[PDB]
Amino acid sequence: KLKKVLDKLRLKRKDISEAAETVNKVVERLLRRMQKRESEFKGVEQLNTGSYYEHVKISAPNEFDVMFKLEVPRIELQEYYETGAFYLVKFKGNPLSHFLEGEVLSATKMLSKFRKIIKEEVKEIKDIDVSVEKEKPGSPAVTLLIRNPEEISVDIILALESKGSWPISTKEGLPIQGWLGTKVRTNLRREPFYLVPKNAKDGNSFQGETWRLSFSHTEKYILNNHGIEKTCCESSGAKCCRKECLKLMKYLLEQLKKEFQELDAFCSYHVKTAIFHMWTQDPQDSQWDPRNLSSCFDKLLAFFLECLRTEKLDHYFIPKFNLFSQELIDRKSKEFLSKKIEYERNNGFPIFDK
DNA sequence: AAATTGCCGAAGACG
DNA sequence: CGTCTTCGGCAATT
Ligand SMILES: [Mg+2]
Ligand SMILES: [Mg+2]
Ligand SMILES: [Zn+2]
């Protein structure tokens, strides 16, 4: 039964081919745009991220995430209150001085110009039906809508890339030492970290200058390298069901959010965060044998329900950042979601049948 | 040094 | 399950 659901969630190669062909052409064109000439964005480089490129996108290849990352030397980070995740960026005749607000590099000013450029470049595409969606306050995304003729969205995310050691709020995060190990953890933390122009919600409004840490590159590496054994899911090793559990949980949330508006505050990043914690708690590949898919999925569910009940789901890279805090999500919303998940769980998941 | 190239891993397709 | 295939990521090459 979960096996039947996975078969239906699995992406079709024909759909993948048709979608990738069009997405790649539009993205290449926009990136070449940025890269020329006089632009404050001239050195951007592309990094594909999120569930399609991690092979956990479900149902249809209809949403792609791509970062246009800019290396910015000598940046100084000031943590925004004690949030752990949010920062003001300042500096130690640069192109970026246009985006200054005092000595602070404004996320909003820089994103606005980035968006402005993308829109003008989209206007020049005559051979493909592509438009820029209305902007969402506080989001770091410039979202394209492509009609292929099927609808595909592409989120183009500006990012700052910094090569220094990671901010100290991350020092006790990424607790992979008994799963992926200390050499892996140390090596991942020697790679750059990223900031995206997603604004902190501060009371009734966004703080327009703030940026948020991103570990999309690390998350992508983890999904591609997720077993305690080096051969997990390789051609000379044993398949596990870790990614299948993540797909099933993302589907469950998606189906629930489609029918209940009260679940608007929940998102697939909560599910991904929860399963990173579960992969830490249950590190052995033998605990994710495909023969045991039903019980692995059940355990992930039990853990997610416990997060809800205790109002606690800490960011995997930034442990003091509680994604399920009362400030982010009302207690009533979590209680509403717990009720729905329990009903599905106790009734053999009728919602999987649509 | 911007653009092309091939290698091969992940995973869909199909028997 | 095996074998075949395409897409993506990498970096040397040029
Ligand atoms: Mg996505
Ligand atoms: Mg997205
Ligand atoms: Zn595996």
PDB file of C-alpha atoms in Angstrom, chain A residues 83-267:
ATOM      1  CA  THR A  83      17.154  34.501  16.352  1.00  0.00           C
ATOM      2  CA  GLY A  84      20.235  32.442  15.266  1.00  0.00           C
ATOM      3  CA  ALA A  85      18.924  32.345  11.668  1.00  0.00           C
ATOM      4  CA  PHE A  86      18.583  36.026  10.758  1.00  0.00           C
ATOM      5  CA  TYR A  87      21.403  38.569  10.199  1.00  0.00           C
ATOM      6  CA  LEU A  88      22.247  42.142   9.336  1.00  0.00           C
ATOM      7  CA  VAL A  89      25.159  42.158   6.818  1.00  0.00           C
ATOM      8  CA  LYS A  90      27.782  44.939   7.050  1.00  0.00           C
ATOM      9  CA  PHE A  91      31.262  45.380   5.565  1.00  0.00           C
ATOM     10  CA  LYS A  92      34.899  45.282   6.601  1.00  0.00           C
ATOM     11  CA  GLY A  93      33.785  51.823  -4.884  1.00  0.00           C
ATOM     12  CA  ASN A  94      32.022  48.424  -4.875  1.00  0.00           C
ATOM     13  CA  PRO A  95      28.966  47.500  -7.010  1.00  0.00           C
ATOM     14  CA  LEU A  96      26.913  46.681  -3.914  1.00  0.00           C
ATOM     15  CA  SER A  97      27.129  50.193  -2.338  1.00  0.00           C
ATOM     16  CA  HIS A  98      23.851  50.989  -4.149  1.00  0.00           C
ATOM     17  CA  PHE A  99      22.146  48.566  -1.771  1.00  0.00           C
ATOM     18  CA  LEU A 100      23.608  50.123   1.357  1.00  0.00           C
ATOM     19  CA  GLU A 101      21.359  51.431   4.096  1.00  0.00           C
ATOM     20  CA  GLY A 102      23.854  53.162   6.399  1.00  0.00           C
ATOM     21  CA  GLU A 103      26.555  50.484   6.645  1.00  0.00           C
ATOM     22  CA  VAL A 104      24.006  47.687   6.288  1.00  0.00           C
ATOM     23  CA  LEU A 105      23.609  45.796   3.003  1.00  0.00           C
ATOM     24  CA  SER A 106      19.835  45.851   2.604  1.00  0.00           C
ATOM     25  CA  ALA A 107      18.330  42.501   1.548  1.00  0.00           C
ATOM     26  CA  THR A 108      15.311  44.355   0.174  1.00  0.00           C
ATOM     27  CA  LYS A 109      17.230  46.850  -1.927  1.00  0.00           C
ATOM     28  CA  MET A 110      19.466  44.143  -3.391  1.00  0.00           C
ATOM     29  CA  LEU A 111      16.576  41.726  -4.031  1.00  0.00           C
ATOM     30  CA  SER A 112      14.528  44.497  -5.674  1.00  0.00           C
ATOM     31  CA  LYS A 113      17.224  45.233  -8.248  1.00  0.00           C
ATOM     32  CA  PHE A 114      17.788  41.501  -8.794  1.00  0.00           C
ATOM     33  CA  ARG A 115      14.045  41.028  -9.399  1.00  0.00           C
ATOM     34  CA  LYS A 116      13.948  44.084 -11.652  1.00  0.00           C
ATOM     35  CA  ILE A 117      16.713  42.592 -13.856  1.00  0.00           C
ATOM     36  CA  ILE A 118      15.064  39.141 -13.989  1.00  0.00           C
ATOM     37  CA  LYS A 119      11.762  40.695 -15.076  1.00  0.00           C
ATOM     38  CA  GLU A 120      13.365  42.678 -17.896  1.00  0.00           C
ATOM     39  CA  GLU A 121      15.203  39.574 -19.069  1.00  0.00           C
ATOM     40  CA  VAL A 122      11.968  37.475 -18.938  1.00  0.00           C
ATOM     41  CA  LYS A 123      10.291  40.157 -21.095  1.00  0.00           C
ATOM     42  CA  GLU A 124      12.884  39.371 -23.807  1.00  0.00           C
ATOM     43  CA  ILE A 125      12.041  35.641 -23.995  1.00  0.00           C
ATOM     44  CA  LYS A 126       9.705  35.319 -27.010  1.00  0.00           C
ATOM     45  CA  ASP A 127       9.857  31.598 -27.741  1.00  0.00           C
ATOM     46  CA  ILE A 128       8.702  30.266 -24.343  1.00  0.00           C
ATOM     47  CA  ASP A 129       5.641  31.345 -22.304  1.00  0.00           C
ATOM     48  CA  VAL A 130       7.264  32.544 -19.034  1.00  0.00           C
ATOM     49  CA  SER A 131       6.124  35.286 -16.646  1.00  0.00           C
ATOM     50  CA  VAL A 132       7.302  36.542 -13.254  1.00  0.00           C
ATOM     51  CA  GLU A 133       4.810  35.955 -10.457  1.00  0.00           C
ATOM     52  CA  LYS A 134       3.694  38.752  -8.148  1.00  0.00           C
ATOM     53  CA  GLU A 135       6.200  39.260  -5.394  1.00  0.00           C
ATOM     54  CA  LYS A 136       5.561  37.872  -1.909  1.00  0.00           C
ATOM     55  CA  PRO A 137       6.550  40.163   0.965  1.00  0.00           C
ATOM     56  CA  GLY A 138       9.574  38.950   2.844  1.00  0.00           C
ATOM     57  CA  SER A 139      10.276  36.037   0.443  1.00  0.00           C
ATOM     58  CA  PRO A 140      13.719  35.723  -1.074  1.00  0.00           C
ATOM     59  CA  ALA A 141      12.348  34.221  -4.326  1.00  0.00           C
ATOM     60  CA  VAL A 142      11.743  35.608  -7.786  1.00  0.00           C
ATOM     61  CA  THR A 143       9.303  32.989  -9.024  1.00  0.00           C
ATOM     62  CA  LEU A 144       8.827  32.241 -12.748  1.00  0.00           C
ATOM     63  CA  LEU A 145       5.699  30.661 -14.092  1.00  0.00           C
ATOM     64  CA  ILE A 146       6.391  28.587 -17.219  1.00  0.00           C
ATOM     65  CA  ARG A 147       3.710  27.128 -19.471  1.00  0.00           C
ATOM     66  CA  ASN A 148       5.257  24.244 -21.300  1.00  0.00           C
ATOM     67  CA  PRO A 149       2.173  23.988 -21.986  1.00  0.00           C
ATOM     68  CA  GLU A 150       2.081  22.416 -18.520  1.00  0.00           C
ATOM     69  CA  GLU A 151       2.662  24.808 -15.601  1.00  0.00           C
ATOM     70  CA  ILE A 152       6.056  24.682 -13.989  1.00  0.00           C
ATOM     71  CA  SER A 153       7.295  27.172 -11.386  1.00  0.00           C
ATOM     72  CA  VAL A 154      10.978  28.048 -11.011  1.00  0.00           C
ATOM     73  CA  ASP A 155      12.135  29.842  -7.888  1.00  0.00           C
ATOM     74  CA  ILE A 156      15.297  31.872  -8.626  1.00  0.00           C
ATOM     75  CA  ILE A 157      16.920  32.654  -5.254  1.00  0.00           C
ATOM     76  CA  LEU A 158      19.638  35.296  -4.968  1.00  0.00           C
ATOM     77  CA  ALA A 159      22.256  34.227  -2.361  1.00  0.00           C
ATOM     78  CA  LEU A 160      25.361  35.711  -0.771  1.00  0.00           C
ATOM     79  CA  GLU A 161      28.148  33.170  -0.471  1.00  0.00           C
ATOM     80  CA  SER A 162      30.658  33.509   2.326  1.00  0.00           C
ATOM     81  CA  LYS A 163      33.827  31.461   2.678  1.00  0.00           C
ATOM     82  CA  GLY A 164      34.529  32.134   6.389  1.00  0.00           C
ATOM     83  CA  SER A 165      33.682  29.824   9.311  1.00  0.00           C
ATOM     84  CA  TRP A 166      29.929  29.445   9.892  1.00  0.00           C
ATOM     85  CA  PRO A 167      28.155  31.803  12.343  1.00  0.00           C
ATOM     86  CA  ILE A 168      28.412  30.562  15.906  1.00  0.00           C
ATOM     87  CA  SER A 169      24.681  29.895  16.219  1.00  0.00           C
ATOM     88  CA  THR A 170      25.501  26.814  14.016  1.00  0.00           C
ATOM     89  CA  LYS A 171      28.370  25.538  16.209  1.00  0.00           C
ATOM     90  CA  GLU A 172      26.339  22.761  17.868  1.00  0.00           C
ATOM     91  CA  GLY A 173      24.094  22.095  14.859  1.00  0.00           C
ATOM     92  CA  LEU A 174      24.477  19.387  12.157  1.00  0.00           C
ATOM     93  CA  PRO A 175      24.614  16.602  14.803  1.00  0.00           C
ATOM     94  CA  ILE A 176      25.688  13.915  12.318  1.00  0.00           C
ATOM     95  CA  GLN A 177      28.732  12.577  14.275  1.00  0.00           C
ATOM     96  CA  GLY A 178      27.381   9.078  14.935  1.00  0.00           C
ATOM     97  CA  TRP A 179      25.648   8.781  11.552  1.00  0.00           C
ATOM     98  CA  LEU A 180      27.760  10.432   8.822  1.00  0.00           C
ATOM     99  CA  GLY A 181      30.704  11.013  11.155  1.00  0.00           C
ATOM    100  CA  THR A 182      33.199  13.621  12.225  1.00  0.00           C
ATOM    101  CA  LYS A 183      35.289  13.854   9.054  1.00  0.00           C
ATOM    102  CA  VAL A 184      32.068  14.476   7.030  1.00  0.00           C
ATOM    103  CA  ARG A 185      30.807  17.055   9.543  1.00  0.00           C
ATOM    104  CA  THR A 186      34.120  18.901   9.628  1.00  0.00           C
ATOM    105  CA  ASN A 187      34.467  18.815   5.830  1.00  0.00           C
ATOM    106  CA  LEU A 188      30.884  20.146   5.288  1.00  0.00           C
ATOM    107  CA  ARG A 189      31.581  22.995   7.755  1.00  0.00           C
ATOM    108  CA  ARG A 190      34.712  24.025   5.779  1.00  0.00           C
ATOM    109  CA  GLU A 191      32.498  24.710   2.742  1.00  0.00           C
ATOM    110  CA  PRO A 192      30.978  28.219   2.260  1.00  0.00           C
ATOM    111  CA  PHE A 193      27.683  29.140   3.906  1.00  0.00           C
ATOM    112  CA  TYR A 194      24.915  31.173   2.285  1.00  0.00           C
ATOM    113  CA  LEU A 195      22.596  34.005   3.054  1.00  0.00           C
ATOM    114  CA  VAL A 196      19.303  34.525   1.206  1.00  0.00           C
ATOM    115  CA  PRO A 197      17.255  37.740   1.286  1.00  0.00           C
ATOM    116  CA  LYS A 198      14.397  36.287   3.275  1.00  0.00           C
ATOM    117  CA  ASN A 199      13.321  38.920   5.876  1.00  0.00           C
ATOM    118  CA  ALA A 200      12.675  38.177   9.590  1.00  0.00           C
ATOM    119  CA  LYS A 201       9.036  38.733  10.542  1.00  0.00           C
ATOM    120  CA  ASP A 202       9.251  41.193  13.401  1.00  0.00           C
ATOM    121  CA  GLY A 203       5.871  41.671  15.009  1.00  0.00           C
ATOM    122  CA  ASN A 204       3.449  43.145  12.464  1.00  0.00           C
ATOM    123  CA  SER A 205       5.995  43.607   9.675  1.00  0.00           C
ATOM    124  CA  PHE A 206       9.248  42.393   8.070  1.00  0.00           C
ATOM    125  CA  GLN A 207      12.651  43.820   8.913  1.00  0.00           C
ATOM    126  CA  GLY A 208      13.514  44.670   5.310  1.00  0.00           C
ATOM    127  CA  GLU A 209      17.312  44.610   5.685  1.00  0.00           C
ATOM    128  CA  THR A 210      17.638  41.117   7.201  1.00  0.00           C
ATOM    129  CA  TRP A 211      18.978  37.958   5.555  1.00  0.00           C
ATOM    130  CA  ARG A 212      18.525  34.290   6.552  1.00  0.00           C
ATOM    131  CA  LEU A 213      21.183  31.580   6.672  1.00  0.00           C
ATOM    132  CA  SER A 214      20.766  28.872   3.989  1.00  0.00           C
ATOM    133  CA  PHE A 215      22.341  25.440   4.017  1.00  0.00           C
ATOM    134  CA  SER A 216      20.789  24.231   0.741  1.00  0.00           C
ATOM    135  CA  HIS A 217      24.120  22.987  -0.558  1.00  0.00           C
ATOM    136  CA  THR A 218      24.769  20.952   2.648  1.00  0.00           C
ATOM    137  CA  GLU A 219      21.249  19.550   2.653  1.00  0.00           C
ATOM    138  CA  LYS A 220      21.667  18.457  -0.947  1.00  0.00           C
ATOM    139  CA  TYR A 221      24.967  16.679  -0.125  1.00  0.00           C
ATOM    140  CA  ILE A 222      23.312  14.937   2.859  1.00  0.00           C
ATOM    141  CA  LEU A 223      20.391  13.610   0.768  1.00  0.00           C
ATOM    142  CA  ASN A 224      22.901  12.272  -1.804  1.00  0.00           C
ATOM    143  CA  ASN A 225      25.164  10.773   0.918  1.00  0.00           C
ATOM    144  CA  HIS A 226      22.739   9.679   3.631  1.00  0.00           C
ATOM    145  CA  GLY A 227      23.764   6.204   4.871  1.00  0.00           C
ATOM    146  CA  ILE A 228      26.157   5.234   7.668  1.00  0.00           C
ATOM    147  CA  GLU A 229      27.620   2.816   5.099  1.00  0.00           C
ATOM    148  CA  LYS A 230      29.336   4.441   2.132  1.00  0.00           C
ATOM    149  CA  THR A 231      27.577   2.106  -0.337  1.00  0.00           C
ATOM    150  CA  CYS A 232      24.008   2.890   0.842  1.00  0.00           C
ATOM    151  CA  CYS A 233      21.756   3.169  -2.269  1.00  0.00           C
ATOM    152  CA  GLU A 234      24.788   2.598  -4.548  1.00  0.00           C
ATOM    153  CA  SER A 235      24.953  -0.041  -7.271  1.00  0.00           C
ATOM    154  CA  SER A 236      27.173  -2.276  -5.083  1.00  0.00           C
ATOM    155  CA  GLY A 237      25.352  -1.568  -1.828  1.00  0.00           C
ATOM    156  CA  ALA A 238      21.865  -1.996  -0.263  1.00  0.00           C
ATOM    157  CA  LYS A 239      18.929   0.255  -1.008  1.00  0.00           C
ATOM    158  CA  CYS A 240      17.388   1.970   2.074  1.00  0.00           C
ATOM    159  CA  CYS A 241      13.949   3.587   2.464  1.00  0.00           C
ATOM    160  CA  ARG A 242      15.047   6.975   3.935  1.00  0.00           C
ATOM    161  CA  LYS A 243      14.033   9.005   0.863  1.00  0.00           C
ATOM    162  CA  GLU A 244      10.805   7.039   0.401  1.00  0.00           C
ATOM    163  CA  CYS A 245       9.813   8.001   3.993  1.00  0.00           C
ATOM    164  CA  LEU A 246      10.508  11.635   3.241  1.00  0.00           C
ATOM    165  CA  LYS A 247       8.373  11.501   0.086  1.00  0.00           C
ATOM    166  CA  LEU A 248       5.434   9.911   1.959  1.00  0.00           C
ATOM    167  CA  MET A 249       5.574  12.508   4.738  1.00  0.00           C
ATOM    168  CA  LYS A 250       5.793  15.400   2.228  1.00  0.00           C
ATOM    169  CA  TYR A 251       2.780  13.952   0.368  1.00  0.00           C
ATOM    170  CA  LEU A 252       0.752  13.572   3.572  1.00  0.00           C
ATOM    171  CA  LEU A 253       1.459  17.232   4.469  1.00  0.00           C
ATOM    172  CA  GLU A 254       0.740  18.468   0.948  1.00  0.00           C
ATOM    173  CA  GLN A 255      -2.592  16.645   0.743  1.00  0.00           C
ATOM    174  CA  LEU A 256      -3.631  17.979   4.139  1.00  0.00           C
ATOM    175  CA  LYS A 257      -2.608  21.597   3.295  1.00  0.00           C
ATOM    176  CA  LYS A 258      -4.647  21.353   0.047  1.00  0.00           C
ATOM    177  CA  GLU A 259      -7.815  20.813   1.952  1.00  0.00           C
ATOM    178  CA  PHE A 260      -7.272  22.740   5.186  1.00  0.00           C
ATOM    179  CA  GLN A 261      -6.433  26.451   5.015  1.00  0.00           C
ATOM    180  CA  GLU A 262      -5.659  26.382   8.755  1.00  0.00           C
ATOM    181  CA  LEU A 263      -2.445  24.512   7.859  1.00  0.00           C
ATOM    182  CA  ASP A 264      -0.991  27.456   5.932  1.00  0.00           C
ATOM    183  CA  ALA A 265       1.880  27.977   8.431  1.00  0.00           C
ATOM    184  CA  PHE A 266       3.241  24.442   7.835  1.00  0.00           C
ATOM    185  CA  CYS A 267       5.675  23.731   5.000  1.00  0.00           C
TER     186      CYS A 267
END
